[PDB]
Design a protein around this ligand. Structure first.
Ligand SMILES: CCCCCCCCCCCCCCCCC[C@@H](O)O[C@H](CO[C@H](O)CCCCCCCCCCCCCCC)COP(=O)(O)OCC[N+](C)(C)C
Ligand SMILES: CCCCCCCCCCCCCCCCC[C@@H](O)O[C@H](CO[C@H](O)CCCCCCCCCCCCCCC)COP(=O)(O)OCC[N+](C)(C)C
Ligand SMILES: CCCCCCCCCCCCCCCCC[C@@H](O)O[C@H](CO[C@H](O)CCCCCCCCCCCCCCC)COP(=O)(O)OCC[N+](C)(C)C
Ligand SMILES: CCCCCCCCCCCCCCCCC[C@@H](O)O[C@H](CO[C@H](O)CCCCCCCCCCCCCCC)COP(=O)(O)OCC[N+](C)(C)C
Ligand SMILES: CCCCCCCCCCCCCCCCC[C@@H](O)O[C@H](CO[C@H](O)CCCCCCCCCCCCCCC)COP(=O)(O)OCC[N+](C)(C)C
Ligand SMILES: CCCCCCCCCCCCCCCCC[C@@H](O)O[C@H](CO[C@H](O)CCCCCCCCCCCCCCC)COP(=O)(O)OCC[N+](C)(C)C
Ligand SMILES: CCCCCCCC/C=C\CCCCCCCC(=O)O[C@H](COC(=O)CCCCCCC/C=C/CCCCCCCC)COP(=O)(O)OCCN
Lengths: 96, 96, 470, 48
């Protein structure tokens, strides 16, 4: 590896005492800085991304009511499912 | 409202600890490139490596042709070169 | 002097050796390092109680004297003015005849001076100095507050805006960060007048809207629009609540107090024409700010420390669990702004810092007070995290403005912890090194924005050697 | 470690004032110091 570096240095001499090229410095440094900041930040993104549960409304599709005395027999039993379950309209919510 | 049961373990010691552990492990691993680089400066700042490269090639070639005694002697020479830094300075000096 | 010595030594090495870039780098021999001419229990309990008592007294008296050290300038100034006041008021009271003689009764301008005394003034002086258990501390604290009235006013405005986040409550801190904190050491009288007038108009307008006859306020519209951040009165700040005034009387009182203190001490076709009357005023303001003679100082460490505390605040808010989708965005932008700020400090460009500061204040304010409530809840109903974050950011803005006004000094390079080889410095340096990813970024950015011949690896070696040697 | 600390400070100062050639020469000297342990013993010897 060192020999390859030395041959490369021989092939393209650099002037005696000079500013390092801005383009190479910017590319290498931006790459490293972006990599380090990504390491710092992305785990937070994933942790906050998996726990993105969204509330889904569940509305009872059936309601059953039973009136029972002692242990003899349900005196009354009624179940309402589709047309007798009226969801609240905004106007009704306002009234409430 | 209901959401799919993907709650699992939540933050506030739940999964935060894993994030801290991963960031510290990666931090140590990256620091490995920055911490004790100077220590290995006597083995990587060589101006000319021609003699050492030739010596290693000689070891390979002798090992190929089956004359083991030379291989042992060449290996001894190489080990001693890496055993004394000052002889390494003398040996890797830029040729004139 | 250091540069001349180094050049001379290198010339001596050249002459001694007298007797391609990689070759200069890989050019070292032993002769460099040759020495060139050396080149029974009751008494113990009483002792402990007296010890604690005297320690407390020493601590409080040290605090008082330190605060008095803060007040030194204004205290001496008030002393000389009050002495002159007593001397003048006699002749003013009897008739009032001569101005030169009464001033010259006791080198026209001297900061500190001594002349004949008057019994009444020192009489009162050591009468007040007689009492010092608490009253001296209170007097010192009040004196400090009076001496730093401008900061108090700025602080009150920021606190007022922190609560009641609304455009009406927003326009003034923007002026603070963009106009008041940049003119000249003394912000222009026009700014104080506009602050006082604006707060008066705001209190009256809120009072007028407060009345329930207006349609917005019906007890039904208000109830349904209880926590919706974008109700029009709430955004404009005209919404009615029992506590309609929330740090507005205090702000006005503070502004007037500052004005009074300053007064007692100191000085107090059509489109083309319109834009050529307006814009040159702004250009003149910016030019006079950019080019002027000022004392230089460096406060980069405090700015960075403020940003670090800000990041800690964001992470704590993230842990305190919507808003995280905004916390992450602010976190990433915070990292970016810290990098740009580091680059500006290294390059030492005042203009760049000024432009970045203006952009930053405008963007933070807009994002925090509009977009954030549009994507989340009210900023001030909750999110004490958001309010604390904004307060720290405001401190950062103040430091940056001060830095711009003073200007960058020379000789910025060098870690601030390696100025003294003290035990505390060692602990701080090791602690700073311990934190993950700071030495990494610190070395990489310094290499990027400091001009040099060395490669990144070579720079890494120099930095490591220096740290270990320290 | 006085000499080494002074040398590192010299590198920083020269890098600050923009005279790169001196920076290259000083860096070469520092690298050689860390490249030879015996010269390091000689260089870090307790001053008299
Ligand atoms: C992931 C989050 C980050 C994403 C990347 C965005 C953030 C990057 C910010 C990088 C710093 C930007 C600095 C902007 C310039 C500040 C200093 C200024 O001086 O730069 C000048 C101009 O710089 C040049 O334009 C070079 C490019 C500048 C912008 C860099 C873009 C390349 C990306 C670098 C940032 C990478 C960040 C990566 C983060 C992961 C240099 O000229 P100078 O000699 O002072 O002239 C003096 C002028 N005076 C007289 C008025 C004072
Ligand atoms: C979020 C997205 C980020 C972008 C995508 C990821 C990008 C890749 C991750 C970052 C890659 C960093 C590459 C660093 C290459 C270093 C090359 C080395 O030679 O540079 C030296 C400095 O390198 C230092 O060792 C850097 C120290 C830190 C290195 C560890 C951080 C980067 C780890 C990258 C791991 C990527 C894993 C990807 C998995 C998919 C200085 O150059 P020098 O040797 O003098 O030149 C000799 C003569 N030449 C020019 C003729 C050759
Ligand atoms: C909700 C939205 C409200 C918008 C309101 C916009 C208002 C913005 C500007 C605020 C008012 C302008 C102030 C600018 C002042 C500049 C000139 C100023 O320096 O002159 C001062 C002089 O100022 C005047 O004294 C008072 C000016 C009062 C101006 C009232 C403007 C009212 C505007 C109302 C707008 C309402 C809009 C409502 C929209 C719904 C000098 O004072 P000084 O000489 O040192 O005082 C000495 C006092 N003595 C004599 C007792 C010793
Ligand atoms: C750390 C331990 C805890 C305490 C921390 C500090 C706590 C501070 C609490 C708040 C202090 C409020 C101080 C109020 C100062 C009033 C200043 C006001 O009087 O100034 C005058 C009024 O200014 C204007 O009105 C601006 C509005 C200020 C309104 C303040 C109202 C305070 C009322 C106090 C009433 C006390 C009554 C006591 C019983 C009679 C004009 O100035 P003038 O007096 O000419 O001379 C000024 C120079 N002096 C002071 C050195 C002589
Ligand atoms: C319902 C809600 C109502 C809200 C109403 C808000 C009203 C706000 C009005 C704001 C007016 C600002 C006026 C600024 C006056 C400056 C006066 C001028 O003189 O300033 C000069 C220069 O002005 C400064 O440059 C002011 C710069 C202010 C820049 C603010 C930018 C804000 C951008 C906001 C963008 C918002 C976008 C929102 C989404 C589209 C410096 O002068 P100065 O040194 O004193 O010397 C005065 C005495 N002399 C002349 C005799 C010496
Ligand atoms: C939950 C975590 C929250 C912790 C919050 C900590 C945040 C730390 C941020 C770093 C603070 C920096 C303090 C900077 C001090 C100013 C130093 C100075 O250089 O700046 C001044 C100007 O710069 C800006 O004006 C300063 C920015 C405003 C700083 C306000 C910070 C408020 C601190 C609150 C302390 C609370 C203590 C509570 C203890 C229990 C220059 O002097 P000036 O004042 O021009 O006039 C000279 C008068 N002198 C000479 C007599 C002094
Ligand atoms: C949830 C915990 C996260 C970690 C919290 C750690 C808290 C530690 C609290 C105090 C640390 C303060 C000390 C560090 C401050 C240095 C101040 C300073 O001087 O600033 C620069 C700042 O250093 C840099 O320039 C590099 C850093 C700037 C880029 C920031 C990269 C992004 C921020 C990363 C934060 C870390 C991410 C994980 C958390 C670990 C640390 C927060 C370094 O010094 P110089 O400028 O040489 O001194 C000049 C003196 N005139």
């Amino acid at each position: 590896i060192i020999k390859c570096s030395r041959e490369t240095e021989k092939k393209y001499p650099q002037p005696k005492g000079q500013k390092k090229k801005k383009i190479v410095k910017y590319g290498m440094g931006g790459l490293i800085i972006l990599f380090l900041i990504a390491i710092i930040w992305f785990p937070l993104l994933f942790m906050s991304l998996i726990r993105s549960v969204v509330g889904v409304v569940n509305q009872p599709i059936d309601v059953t009511v039973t009136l029972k005395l002692g242990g003899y027999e349900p005196l009354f039993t009624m179940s309402a499912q589709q047309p007798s379950i009226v969801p609240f309209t905004p106007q009704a919510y306002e009234e409430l | 409202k209901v959401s799919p049961p993907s709650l699992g373990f939540l933050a506030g010691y739940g999964i935060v600890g894993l994030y801290v552990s991963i960031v510290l492990v990666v931090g140590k691993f990256v620091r490995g490139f920055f911490s004790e680089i100077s220590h290995s400066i006597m083995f990587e700042e060589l101006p000319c490596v021609d003699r050492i490269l030739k010596l290693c090639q000689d070891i390979f070639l002798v090992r190929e042709t089956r004359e083991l005694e030379l291989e042992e002697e060449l290996y001894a020479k190489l080990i001693f070169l890496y055993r004394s830094p000052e002889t390494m300075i003398k040996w890797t000096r830029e040729r004139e | 002097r250091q540069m001349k010595r180094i050049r001379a030594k290198q010339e001596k090495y050249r002459q001694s050796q007298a007797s391609d870039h990689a070759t200069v780098i890989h050019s070292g021999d032993y002769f460099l390092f040759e020495s060139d001419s050396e080149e029974h229990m009751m008494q113990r309990v009483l002792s402990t109680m007296q010890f604690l008592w005297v320690l407390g007294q020493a601590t409080v008296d040290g605090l008082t004297r330190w605060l008095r050290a803060f007040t030194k300038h204004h205290r001496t100034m008030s002393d000389v003015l009050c002495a002159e006041r007593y001397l003048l008021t006699q002749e003013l009271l009897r008739v009032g005849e001569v101005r030169r003689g009464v001033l010259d009764q006791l080198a026209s301008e001297l900061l500190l001076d001594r002349r004949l005394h008057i019994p009444e003034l020192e009489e009162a002086e050591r009468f007040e100095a007689q009492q010092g258990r608490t009253l001296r501390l209170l007097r010192a604290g009040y004196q400090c507050v009076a001496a730093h009235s401008e900061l108090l006013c700025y602080f009150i405005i920021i606190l007022n805006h922190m609560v009641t986040a609304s455009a009406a409550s927003l326009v003034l801190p923007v002026l603070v960060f963009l106009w008041a904190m940049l003119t000249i050491p003394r912000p222009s009288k026009r700014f104080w007048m506009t602050a006082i007038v604006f707060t008066e108009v705001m209190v009256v307008t809120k009072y007028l809207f407060q009345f329930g006859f207006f349609p917005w306020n019906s007890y039904v519209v208000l109830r349904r629009y209880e926590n919706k951040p974008y109700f029009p009165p709430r955004i404009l700040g005209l919404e009615k609540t029992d506590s309609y005034i929330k740090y507005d009387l205090v702000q006005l009182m503070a502004l007037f107090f500052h004005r009074s203190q300053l007064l007692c001490y100191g000085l107090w076709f059509c489109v083309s024409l319109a834009q050529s009357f307006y814009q040159p005023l702004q250009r003149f303001f910016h030019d006079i700010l950019h080019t002027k003679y000022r004392a230089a100082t460096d406060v980069y460490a405090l700015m960075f420390l403020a940003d670090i505390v800000d990041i800690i605040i964001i992470i704590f808010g993230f842990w305190a669990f919507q808003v995280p989708q905004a916390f992450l965005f602010m976190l990433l932008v915070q990292f970016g702004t810290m990098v740009i700020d580091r680059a500006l400090y290294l390059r030492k460009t005042v203009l760049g810092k000024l432009a970045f500061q203006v952009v930053l204040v405008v963007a933070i304010h807009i994002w925090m007070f509009f977009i954030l409530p549009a994507v989340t809840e009210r900023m001030f109903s909750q999110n004490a995290v958001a309010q604390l974050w904004y307060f720290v950011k405001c401190i950062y803005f103040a430091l940056s403005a001060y830095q711009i006004r003073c200007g960058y000094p020379t000789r910025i390079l060098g870690n601030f912890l390696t100025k003294k080889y003290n035990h505390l410095n060692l602990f701080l340096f090791q602690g700073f090194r311990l934190v993950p990813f700071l030495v990494e970024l610190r070395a990489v950015m310094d290499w990027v924005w400091t001009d040099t011949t060395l490669s990144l690896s070579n720079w890494m070696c120099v930095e490591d050697i220096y740290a270990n040697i320290f």
